[PDB]
Amino acid sequence: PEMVRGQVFDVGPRYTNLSYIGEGAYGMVCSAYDNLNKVRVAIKKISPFEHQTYCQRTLREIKILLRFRHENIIGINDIIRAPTIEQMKDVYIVQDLMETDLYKLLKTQHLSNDHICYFLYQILRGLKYIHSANVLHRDLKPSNLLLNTTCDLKICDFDLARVADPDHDHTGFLTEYVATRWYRAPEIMLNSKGYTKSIDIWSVGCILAEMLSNRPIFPGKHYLDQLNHILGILGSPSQEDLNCIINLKARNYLLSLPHKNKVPWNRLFPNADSKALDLLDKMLTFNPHKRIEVEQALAHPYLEQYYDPSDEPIAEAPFKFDMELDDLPKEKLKELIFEETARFQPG
Numbered sequence: 001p002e003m004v005r006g007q008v009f010d011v012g013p014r015y016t017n018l019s020y021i022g023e024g025a026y027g028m029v030c031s032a033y034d035n036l037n038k039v040r041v042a043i044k045k046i047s048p049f050e051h052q053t054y055c056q057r058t059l060r061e062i063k064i065l066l067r068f069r070h071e072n073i074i075g076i077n078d079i080i081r082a083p084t085i086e087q088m089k090d091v092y093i094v095q096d097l098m099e100t101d102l103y104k105l106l107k108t109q110h111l112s113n114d115h116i117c118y119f120l121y122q123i124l125r126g127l128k129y130i131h132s133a134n135v136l137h138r139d140l141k142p143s144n145l146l147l148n149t150t151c152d153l154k155i156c157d158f159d160l161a162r163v164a165d166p167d168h169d170h171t172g173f174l175t176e177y178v179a180t181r182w183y184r185a186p187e188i189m190l191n192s193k194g195y196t197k198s199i200d201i202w203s204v205g206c207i208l209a210e211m212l213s214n215r216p217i218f219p220g221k222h223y224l225d226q227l228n229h230i231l232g233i234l235g236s237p238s239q240e241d242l243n244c245i246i247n248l249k250a251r252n253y254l255l256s257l258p259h260k261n262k263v264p265w266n267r268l269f270p271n272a273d274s275k276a277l278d279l280l281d282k283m284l285t286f287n288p289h290k291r292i293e294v295e296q297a298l299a300h301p302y303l304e305q306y307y308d309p310s311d312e313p314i315a316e317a318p319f320k321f322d323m324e325l326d327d328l329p330k331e332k333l334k335e336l337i338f339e340e341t342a343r344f345q346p347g
């Protein structure tokens with residue numbers, strides 16, 4: 001078994017000639033040569049079985065991507081693991097190899113408007129399909145948007161994805177959250193568990209702003225500083241939005257703040273297209289109930305050159321009910337991971 005940066009990649013006969021891409025808490029991602037399709041692929045080695053939370057995230061990643069088939073969503077081409085549950089210690093997930101991600105691209109290049117427009121179109125096209133399956137991505141950010149030189153974009157990383165549950169979205173003020181700080185909607189800090197589609201639209205708004213200036217729009221240094229950044233640009237919420245805030249503590253907090261005027265989008269982004277900023281405004285709407293939905297965003301004048309509902313497919317088989325992985329022990333989750341990966345075994 002070949003080694004990369006001091007890690008055993010036991011991918012067997014089908015995959016050889018490895019090369020390091022990146023790393024994270026999840027494990028390591030590498031490029032490899034596929035000996036059955038004759039093309040280079042991405043392979044990531046995951047070792048989650050010692051903790052329930054790592055098993056939940058691994059089962060979410062696998063279960064969702066196996067049920068999706070869309071041009072703007074990374075697939076899972078193969079999964080390698082041991083023939084028995086007793087011997088399964090690692091899981092290797094094989095995916096299409098891309099050239100870079102939007103995080104890396106924005107460090108080296110300023111994007112023209114027509115690149116921004118096409119990338120935004122693909123993000124929303126993929127998100128329409130996700131949301132049509134009643135699924136929430138919950139961690140959209142530049143490093144989860146994969147790109148190639150032909151400018152194809154694919155959304156990856158569904159380890160925080162959940163089935164939408166608007167009836168159980170409520171939570172208290174300043175409730176802990178797992179998804180990436182800078183892309184969190186204001187309601188996450190005020191009254192929301194991130195169980196509605198609107199959570200993803202806010203993240204897309206953040207990504208659009210980031211493509212317009214090569215800098216994150218709301219770079220909070222810590223948890224409440226994230227809401228300081230959001231309110232710093234959006235200004236004080238309206239009386240109507242305060243009347244929608246649910247929590248006594250959230251309402252008291254917002255009423256205690258000095259009045260702050262809205263920073264105009266054309267001052268933050270003086271060289272941006274006016275239609276891009278009108279769409280940005282609608283995605284970065286404070287009240288999640290008034291925030292634009294994915295189908296409305298695709299229909300916005302900024303994306304009119306690409307908008308074609310007949311070429312923006314939806315899911316055939318939406319997730320009807322919640323996955324219910326929150327109260328399952330790590331041993332049960334290992335069994336489910338084993339069962340979900342069975343279709344890739346020889347025999």
Ligand SMILES: O=C(Nc1ccc2n[nH]c(-c3ccncc3)c2c1)[C@@H]1CCN(CC(=O)N2CCN(c3ccc(-c4ncccn4)cc3)CC2)C1
Nearest residue numbers: 025026042048054057058095096097098099100156157159
């Ligand atoms: O899918 C992912 N990345 C991909 C995919 C295909 C690509 N093709 N081309 C590229 C590419 C990117 C950049 N530049 C050039 C090319 C790809 C990148 C990322 C990598 C990780 N993945 C999520 C994931 O697989 N999981 C969620 C987290 N989970 C998890 C979390 C933590 C731990 C953990 N274990 C031990 C200690 C601490 N934490 C274990 C499991 C494992 C499953 C999202």
